[PDB]
Structures are given as structure tokens and as C-alpha cells.
Symmetry: D2
């Protein structure tokens, strides 16, 4: 049979005996992601350039792809009636949902990732993490500060050569490809497992001068293998979603470690590291700061950063072992 | 006003007093590229996964994007009545158009570029160069062997977050955005010039062990600038058309130099290097093998390879100076 | 808030305490209807006309819009795991669903209605009726022979100037408009109520010579009102879905009564009359053969026909009263 | 081969040795019509119903399809640099193009026709006629007053189940299907001829009480053919472009004769009757007021009305004979 994202989530909610709130949430996400894909692919851009004159906004307003993404996600999530607290990359403070629209889930998200790659048309995406509320207190920032291990669902949307949504939950990672002709996400890879060992490494080598000793040592070894085999190939798109996705599907390792300008690391823990690290773990892969598991860090700031190394298990441990050795 | 690719092409043909055969040719090229863009974004993919039943072709029974792209290009172009010789990365021999469909142009193209990036949904593209057939004798493969200096037009379509067609001719380089809701390319950026000096470097460092010393030295300055300025950032998508286009839009440098497994460079002279050098040049940048201008190479095989270094003029110039210095 | 069809059905299944089987069914229908809309609007027709040559089917096969509709519906319904018996306009015998895919619902449908209007591009649609299985016996034709009053859900999809799906269930009729850019049905009219009295009548007057006395009398009166007011306007598209939809939204009356060639009437009772008559009743309108209510006819043949008059209550009763008088 | 509207238009312009200004004009017209088609099908309608929030414009604050259509037409056409005078159903006065944008053509159009059918989702269309400006004096409204006999081109886009553009010029009538997945019109039916005699009649019979006796007699023969052949079928969509196009494709007759509330007929000479008569004539059919050819009327007001009878030659001829007979 053919499986659509919409039938998959519903069949998994039925199996789980869920009241449906989460199903409704995911169905929301799936609508938000299409809305975002269409905007990213520039449908309707002729109207910006005056195809029908300029009568159309008497108001002075037109939205950055960034702002619009954020609007779509917030409104679409709020509409699902399934969330109490949202955390966006774009808001300094957690968003507490009005009581009349309040459900039991906490969503951390990057509405659009890969922003240095927007104006040059390289791939970008959306990264999301879902938790259930613990407390019985009035929902607050506190509810979003959970460690990754606690995620109920996570994944991302990539807008590349085509659009793909990847969803991880307790029983695995599935990839669904968007068919833009009918607006339906089609299950295309089931229960995805990352290769033990890859042949690609992905890091911004422009910080070479600022890497700690173990990265430097590891990078060296990718380029001059001591066993004299073939060097890993390099790839670094510049968009976390794209490098992470290539990593899942081809294997290899992706790195964003601490440097001079970011000594805690660049990437955000709540709506960048955590979700990607959850996906990576359901698929049999690893995600470490180099010192601890990423999913085990208990955050204290919704916008806190962390270094991350993620990918194939043999490659990431190879790197961990360099760290262990150096210490 | 609003300027669609169709009106631009037509008006430029009218100004140059063309007979209309080149216009017809770029019009075809514009249609080819929309049909590839839709296949790339996976429209109607639901039919492959049995939405309307008859599941019967599954696994790898049916036609890869690469092949479909090639077909669209060959068939759309023959239909313009403007070509006599086509050379495609995907065909071992030049294609000679039937007399009843012969026009005066030669076209070299890479129907779909960045094939290592297809399965992982990274940006992919189509590259093209157009030549005016000089000889009066029977059209043939040697017709496709002109130096890049001779191009009448070259450019590319990037299938990225959004689809863009970049077209260069004697009077400059223009960027057209594809609005997929109306099937129209919209002129978005006009008479583009690349900046004098960028701060991004693009290369596959996996090959670090194979690099010549100029290349090696140059990477060093990028990471450890002797004068202690900010180090360059690295970006390498793995798709030529994506790396090149970022390089045009953002400035900086792109390299695929010679290595051991590729003593002549990996990239193809006729349908990757030439068009890209032409675009880069008409934009105010440089394209060199390290020793000579790409566009002046005298091609002897239609699938010949070359080393290619391109982008911001000061960046390429600094690298040429390292070459000269290293005898 | 904005309501999508997908969120609406799910919110109504939650309210109803349904296990979800029906929700899954409707979500299926909604996917089938998009798939159908895209095909009807001719996306991809360039491939039929050879945009990429003719390499693409080595097989001799291409589908009528009619056959393809039917494939989409059957397969999509079967996939919902929610149906046991389907009745199609296109199959002489009821379709009994395999046990491993069997649920509790019976669906009668016209995959595409308005076929004399296909080749001239006039509006066409899809008409569906859903029943719950009564028996505990092995599902058979018998399960589909229920009177209309027994419907659980009904509606239709119109593909006109835009695409609209109309859905009626116990608590009303709602219209959702398809937004083809994101593939989502958007609630656009809520709890729809037909006007008491309209000013349009819709019948094929070419059979004038074969109408019974009451129609003739009623038509006369629409054209020469005895109270000397303004005559009704005439409209007859030729597609039941379109004339029925105009009827719901503008008011008026639609007629397909018995004639020489069809003395039982043309339209099918199970997947034409019944569904339209259910919609018409939830909206406060009437549907009569002229002698009995349409929804109260207990069918004995899955393909049985019946005359129908439907529409605004004052207009349809006005017609009934002529019948009553003549008898 | 495959023939797109863009290549047809270009090739016909090349064969006729045009300067390219008319080509540019039909190219614009082709783009106008795709942009209307997408607005008509409701793409991005999700934004109007607050999907990305900011619900603030609701009810009837924002721009009706009719207005958007008009704007697209005026702006796309001025941008072609090929027009000097435009007349639109939606503008009280002719529009005179600015000198810097003046070309030599005059265009009369009905940006969106079948407005009674908009809210009910029935087929709607755009009608156009193009004239060559004869006078050397300042361009003005009288420039738009040529008889239909003078048209260089006329035709229509039908927004139906699928979108089709029908274009007629001196050398015949051609049907192009719009493939909305690539934004290309595909030549689908070439050099169309309407059949000699059809079996469908199209009229609003609601006006039966106002009809002249020729019309009245003619309807009678249609329902009660004196020679006892099969009676004609009736079809009346309520959108001129839909009724007319069915009439071209299927044969038969279309009438909007004079009535009491419309002593001169309702339909407009310049942008409904003229173009349609021209298409019908170039197809081998007839277009008459009942007494004279539509195309020979000498228009005195740009919004003048006329009675119109068109379609299969033998059908119109029979009706003219009834006119003649009734003195
Ligand atoms: N659609 C679904 N897919 C996977 N798990 C679900 C789904 N719905 C509910 N569950 C599981 O059931 C729990 C409670 O469900 P709910 O009653 O929908 O809030 C969730 O937190 C999930 O672990
Ligand atoms: N659409 C166009 N845009 C720019 N230059 C053109 C165009 N068409 C023709 N030309 C120039 O005029 C030459 C002859 O045109 P053609 O007769 O179409 O081959 C070409 O080689 C171009 O240099
Ligand atoms: N999505 C829904 N919308 C409206 N009614 C529903 C829905 N789901 C279930 N119901 C009602 O519940 C009955 C049994 O539901 P189910 O358990 O889904 O087969 C149906 O036959 C409906 O009357
Ligand atoms: N694309 C075209 N298709 C058919 N005829 C054309 C075309 N372009 C020009 N012509 C004919 O040539 C005349 C002058 O062309 P132009 O110089 O473009 O105004 C027009 O009035 C048409 O009769
Ligand atoms: O240019 P840099 O410092 O490598 O940063 C790249 C990272 O920045 C981000 O845009 C921050 O979100 C990531 O998507 C990406 O991996
Ligand atoms: O993996 P490598 O050796 O860097 O090759 C990448 C290059 O290869 C190509 O795919 C050759 O087509 C280019 O698109 C790209 O720049
Ligand atoms: O031409 P006739 O006899 O009026 O039949 C029209 C009817 O035929 C049908 O196509 C039969 O399904 C209906 O959609 C439509 O109302
Ligand atoms: O309702 P009436 O009087 O038949 O008018 C229908 C005619 O009116 C128009 O809408 C006038 O634009 C035509 O499209 C159509 O043929
Ligand atoms: Mg962001
Ligand atoms: Mg981010
Ligand atoms: Mg290629
Ligand atoms: Mg290539
Ligand atoms: Mg049917
Ligand atoms: Mg039918
Ligand atoms: Mg109009
Ligand atoms: Mg009109």
C-alpha cells in the first residue's frame, strides 16, 4: 500500500491509544511544513515584483521568509489545541499558550535553519522537538527545560532539491517525501538506520586555528589515515539541517565544536542539537559534545548552546576516544 | 515593470536584430529547465509509490532523474530548430541534429549536476554553454571543441531552496527567480558583479594529501592568515552549481584543483568549467587552472577535464601569485 | 483560527468518541480528491505530448481521467483499512474488500461525474456516500442496499473554477476550498443552509416533449409566473455536481425526472441521488422523485435509477403540490 | 514534436516577418492568463483565512478576483510595449498607454467573464480581441471602435476543469492546454473546425416570455422537431466562454438574443461578441445578430451591446431562415 504522513501518524496514534491530541499536533506540523515549503520555493513571488502593479498592499508590509516561517509555525501549532509552551529561536522568551487553546505538549523549534544560506538558495529547513508537560503547575519556561532523553517526537524538514520531513519517535525514524502536486507527504524510507561507519566528515575548517587538540588530531587522520586507506571526503553545506540529513542517509560525521568566538559552541541545544541528536540516536547513531551525551544535558537557559559531534557510531566513538586519550 | 525571462530574451533578441533562432533556443532552454525543476521537486512521486494502484514497478525498474533531465534537454532543444550539435555529459559522442531540425547553434550541457547529492536532497543543477557554429562543413563533434572564449551564452539553473536560472551573455549576467505557481522566471537580479574580495573558501579538503603546494599554502593563509585578520569560512556543498552560485552571490573562491587520482582535475571543460568560467568572467571574476585562463584552453576531447579555480578577482589573484612563486 | 479539512475531521472524530476508523476513511477520501483534482487540472500533460520524447512508457498504457479516478478512489479507500464493500459507477458488481484490509464502512461513489462535459472542459466532480455495515454476515452487495436515510456521511468534490469538497454528516454541511499551493482543504463555509426559495431552475429542456404534465406545468410557471413577478433564470451545466452545488449555494431547483428514454429517470440512486439528497436535506432543502422522498427508497439494484427533484424547500414543495394536484 | 504556446507564437511571428512586437504581445497575454488561472484556482487562499496569523482583514476588505484579473491584464499588457489603447469591461473609458510604453496594438478584453458563476465555482474565462491601430493621429477610444472584421487576433482562456487557451488568427484556430506543473500551454488541438451541424442548443429560457417569434419558433423545432428526429439537448452554463467553447468543440448553437430588458441584447460588442464571432468564423461557423453578421457591425460606443447567435453553420442558417420568414 501507499502510506501518507497523515495516515501514518493517525495509525500510530491509534496503536498508542492516544486521545488524539498529539496526532492533531503532528498533523499541524505537517501543514505548517507544506506552508513553509511553498513559501521557500518562491511560489507567488511575481506579485512581489509587480506582476499586477502595486495596488495590492496599501499597507507597507512584506514578510522575510524567516518571520513568515515563525508566524506559520506558531499559529499552526496554537491551532492544534495541543501545546502549552512554545520555544522559538526567534523569541527571547518562551511563548505561553492562552488557556482556551492550551494542551499538554511543549514544542521547541527552529522555524528556518541555515540562514547564511538563504540568499544564495542553498538548502534550509525546520527543526522541531516535542516534550510532554511534567508539572501540573502553570506552564512556564521551566517546562521546556527538559533533557533530550525526554523527547516524545523530533525531526526536521529539509527544503533541498526536494522537500523531506523526517520524524523520529520512540520506535524509529521514518522519512517522508513531499509530493507538491497533491500536497501529501509520502513514506519513502522506513525505520531508518545510519551506517556504522561512513566516509564523509563535515565541519567548518575555517576555524582550524581555534579547534581543540582532539578535533585537530581527528581531522588530520581523516586526511592522512594512519592505516594508509582512502581519506574521508569533505562536505559542509553550511546548513545544519542539510549536513545532518546527508549524515543520516550516507553515514559519516558532522561536527560543530567549541571555538574562540563560540567556546560553548554555536548551535542551540533546545531546537538544534537536541532534535538532531534524538533523530541520530533512534537511528543507531551517536551525538556527543565530546565529553557527555547531548541528550543528557539538562538545560538552564532556553537559548543555551552546546558543542555537538554526531553521526555514525564508529566515527563518533573514534573521535570520543581521541578526547578520552588527550584528557 | 516586471520582467519575465520570456520578455527579456525576446527584447534582447529584438535589440540585437536576431532572426529569432537564438531566442527560440533560449525559450526552449527556459522550458527545459522548468520541466526538470518539477521532476526534481518530486511532483507526482505519489504515483511511483502506488497511489493509484498497480504497484508493479518497484525498486529500480524506472527512469532516474538524471536520465529524465537528459531527455528533457535533448528533446526540448531539438524542438527549437536552432541547434546542429549537442554535447552532453551523459552521452559518449556528440549528438548531431537531423537536417530537417538543424539550426546554427552548438550546445554543451550537464543535464543534472551534483549527482553525489541527489539521494541526500542537496542542491543540484543544470549547466549549459552555447556556441555559434563556425564551419561551413558538415556539423560534427569538432564543432563542439571551441574555446570558452567563443561562447555566445552560458549559465545554469540551480535547483535549491528555490529554483533560479542564471544567464550570461556579452552584455552581462542576470539572475531570474522561478515562480513555480505561474511557470515564469522573474528577473530578480540584474547585471551582476561579483565582489572584489570574499571571505569564504570552497574546496574538498579530503584531498589534502594530494594537493600541490600552492593549493596547500593557500589553504594555510585562509585558516592562519599571516597578518592575523579574521580567517576565511569554509563552505563546500558538493554540487558545483551550488558552490559556484554561492561564490557569485556572496564572493570568495571555489577550487577543484588537480590531485593524484585526477592529474587533469576532475571537472569537465566543455559543460562544467567553460560555462562557469564564462559566467564568472562576465561578472568581473576570474577562472584559472592555476596557470592559464580556463576560457582560453583549446579542447581536444569533448569530455576533457580541467583544473578550475574561480571567483572573487583578488582571491584568485592571490592564489595565482602563490603558483608563480612556487616556480 | 484557520480550520483545515484534516483538523476538522479529526476534531469531529474526537468529539464523537470514534475509534478513528472513520476519520482514517475521510482522511483517505480527502487524499483521493486532491489526487483527482491535480489530474483533472492536467498537471503533467506535457509528458503525454512528448516533452521528454517517447521513451517513458515502453508499455502501451495511458489512463482515461475516468479510469484513473476510479483507481485512485479504490486504492485510497482500501488503504484506509476502513471499508468492507465498495460500489462504483464503473463496476457491474459491488467490490468486496480483502479481509486483511477490511473495516466496517460501505462506500458508494461516482469517481467522476459529468462525463459528457469532460472533453469540453466544463466542471466535473466526485460524489460519495458512506454507510456503516449492519449485518455481522460476510459483507456482500446487500450491505450497500440501504436507504439514504441511513447515510453516515456524504458529499462531493467539484472541480470547477476552483476545487471544493462538500461534506455532510449528522450535524450539518460544511464546504472546504482546496488551496492547491499547500494541498490543504480550508473550511470556507460553515453549517451551510440553502435559501428557502431561489430564483433559478435547472433541467434539460430538450426532453420537453417527454416530460410528464406537472413538470410541464411547473416549467411554464417559471417562465410565465401567474403572479406576474420576474421569471426564474435558467441554468443547466450538464454536470450533476455543478448544478447541484450552484443549487446549494444560490438556491433554486434542480430537476432530473422520468422521460421516454429514461422512464425510471437517468440518475443513479446509490452514488448520485442519494448523496446529493443527503447534502440537500442536512442543509434544510428537499429531495423528492415527485412521489416519495429519495432517501426513503430502499434500493434493490446497486445500479438502480430514480427520478430526482431537489433544492430549496418552497420551490420543491411548489412542484410536489402540482404533482399532488394532478394525481 | 511538442509545441508549446511560446514556440508556436514565436514561429508564427518569424514566418510572418513581424518585428516581434505582436509576439511580445501574445507572450504577455500568455503570462497574464497563467497568473489569472492560479488566482482563480485559489492558490494561497490559506493566507486569507489566517494560516500565518494576523486575521485582521476578514469579510470583504480585500481584492476580488475580478479586480485582480483586470490588474494582471492591464499591467502585463502595458509591459509588452506593444499596445496604445486598451478597453476593458471593467473600465468606463478606454485606457491610453503612456508614450514611453506605446506600441501599435489595441486590445479589448473582459478580464473575467461569467461573474454570476464566480461564487458557485462554475467555469469562468477571459476574452480578448486585438486590433492594429490604423490612424496616425493621437491614440484614443475611437481606436477601439473598429469592426470585428478588422481583428488581427482574438480568443479566450477558459478556467474550467482544466485551463485552456484558444487563439484564432488569419490562418486558423488552435487549442492549447495549460499544464500548470510547468507553466506551459501545450498545443493540443490544431486548426479547429466546428462541425456543420450539432445537436445541442444553448439559451437561457427563463426569458421565454420576452423572446421574438423567430427565437420562439426555433426553440419549438429543437424540442418538437416537425420531421420527428431526435430532439436537441439543452446546455447553458451561464458563462459565455464556457458555453461558446462547448459549442466550438461539440458543435450546435449558442444564443443571447434581444429581450425586453435588453432590447439590444445583453452581451458586449467589443470584448464578448466580437472575439467570439471571430473565433467562430475562423472555425467555419457563423455569428449573427439574427439579421447581420456580428463582425460587420460598426460600433459606436466601446460598451455597446449586441444580440448574438453563433455556432454550427447549418444551425445558425436554419435560425436566420426563420428570421427572414417572419418578415
Ligand atoms: N500519533 C501518535 N503517534 C505516536 N505516538 C502517539 C500518537 N498519539 C499519542 N501517542 C502516544 O500517546 C501519548 C499520549 O497521547 P495523547 O493522548 O495524544 O496526548 C503520547 O505522548 C505518545 O507517546
Ligand atoms: N534572444 C537574444 N538575446 C541576445 N542576443 C541575441 C538573441 N538572439 C540573437 N542574438 C544575437 O544575434 C545573433 C544572431 O541571432 P539569430 O539570428 O537568432 O541566430 C546571435 O548569435 C546573438 O549574438
Ligand atoms: N471523524 C468523524 N467525524 C464525524 N463522526 C465520526 C468520526 N469518527 C467517528 N464518528 C462517529 O462515530 C461512529 C463510529 O466511529 P468509528 O469508531 O470511527 O467507526 C461513526 O460511524 C460516526 O457517527
Ligand atoms: N507572433 C505572431 N503570430 C502571427 N502573426 C504575427 C506575429 N507577429 C506579427 N505577426 C503579423 O505581422 C504583423 C506585424 O508584426 P509586428 O511587427 O510584430 O507588429 C502583425 O499585425 C501580424 O499580422
Ligand atoms: O558558518 P558556521 O559558523 O559554520 O555556522 C554554520 C551553522 O550556522 C547555523 O545557521 C546556525 O543555525 C547552522 O544551520 C549551520 O550549521
Ligand atoms: O566529491 P568531489 O570529488 O568533491 O566532487 C564534487 C564535484 O563533483 C561534481 O559532482 C562533478 O559533477 C561537481 O558537481 C562537484 O563540484
Ligand atoms: O444530458 P442529460 O441527459 O441531461 O444528462 C445529464 C446528466 O448526466 C450525468 O452525466 C450522468 O451522470 C449527470 O452528471 C448529468 O446531470
Ligand atoms: O443570466 P444571463 O442573462 O443568461 O447572462 C448570462 C450571460 O451573462 C454573462 O455573464 C455576461 O457577462 C455571460 O458570461 C453569460 O453568457
Ligand atoms: Mg532560524
Ligand atoms: Mg538555527
Ligand atoms: Mg550531470
Ligand atoms: Mg557535473
Ligand atoms: Mg462517472
Ligand atoms: Mg455519474
Ligand atoms: Mg468580466
Ligand atoms: Mg463578460
Amino acid at each position: 500500500n501507499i502510506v501518507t504522513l497523515t495516515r501514518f501518524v493517525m495509525e500510530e496514534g491509534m496503536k498508542a491509544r492516544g486521545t488524539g491530541e498529539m496526532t492533531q499536533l503532528l498533523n499541524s506540523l505537517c501543514t505548517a511544513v507544506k506552508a513553509i515549503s511553498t513559501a521557500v520555493r518562491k511560489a507567488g513571488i511575481a506579485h512581489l515584483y509587480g506582476i499586477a502593479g502595486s495596488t495590492n498592499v496599501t499597507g507597507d508590509q512584506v514578510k522575510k521568509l524567516d518571520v513568515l516561517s515563525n508566524d506559520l509555525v506558531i499559529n499552526v501549532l496554537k491551532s492544534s489545541f495541543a501545546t502549552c509552551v512554545l520555544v522559538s529561536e526567534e523569541d527571547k522568551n518562551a511563548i505561553i499558550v492562552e488557556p482556551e487553546k492550551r494542551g499538554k505538549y511543549v514544542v521547541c523549534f527552529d522555524p528556518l535553519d541555515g540562514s547564511s544560506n538563504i540568499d544564495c538558495l542553498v538548502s534550509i529547513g525546520t527543526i522541531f522537538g516535542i516534550y510532554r508537560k511534567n508539572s501540573t503547575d502553570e506552564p512556564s519556561e521551566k517546562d521546556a527545560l527538559q533533557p533530550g532523553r525526554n523527547l516524545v517526537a523530533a525531526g526536521y524538514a529539509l527544503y533541498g532539491s526536494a522537500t523531506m520531513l523526517v520524524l523520529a519517535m520512540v520506535n524509529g525514524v521514518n522519512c517522508f517525501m513531499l509530493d507538491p502536486a497533491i500536497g501529501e507527504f509520502i513514506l519513502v524510507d522506513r525505520d531508518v538506520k545510519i551506517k556504522k561507519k561512513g566516509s564523509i566528515y563535515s565541519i567548518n575548517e575555517g576555524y582550524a586555528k581555534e579547534f581543540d587538540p582532539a578535533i585537530t588530531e581527528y581531522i588530520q587522520r581523516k586526511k592522512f589515515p594512519p592505516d594508509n586507506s582512502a581519506p574521508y571526503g569533505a562536505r559542509y553545506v553550511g546548513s545544519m539541517v542539510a549536513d545532518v540529513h546527508r549524515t543520516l542517509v550516507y553515514g559519516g560525521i558532522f561536527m560543530y565544536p567549541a571555538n574562540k568566538k563560540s567556546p560553548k559552541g554555536k548551535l542551540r541545544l533546545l531546537y538544534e542539537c537536541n532534535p538532531m541528536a534524538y533523530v541520530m540516536e533512534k537511528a543507531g547513531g551517536l551525538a556527543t559534545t565530546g565529553k557527555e551525551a547531548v541528550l543528557d544535558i539538562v538545560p538552564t537557559d532556553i537559548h543555551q548552546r552546546a558543542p555537538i559531534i554526531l553521526g555514525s557510531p564508529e566515527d563518533v566513538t573514534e573521535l570520543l576516544e581521541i578526547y578520552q586519550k588527550h584528557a
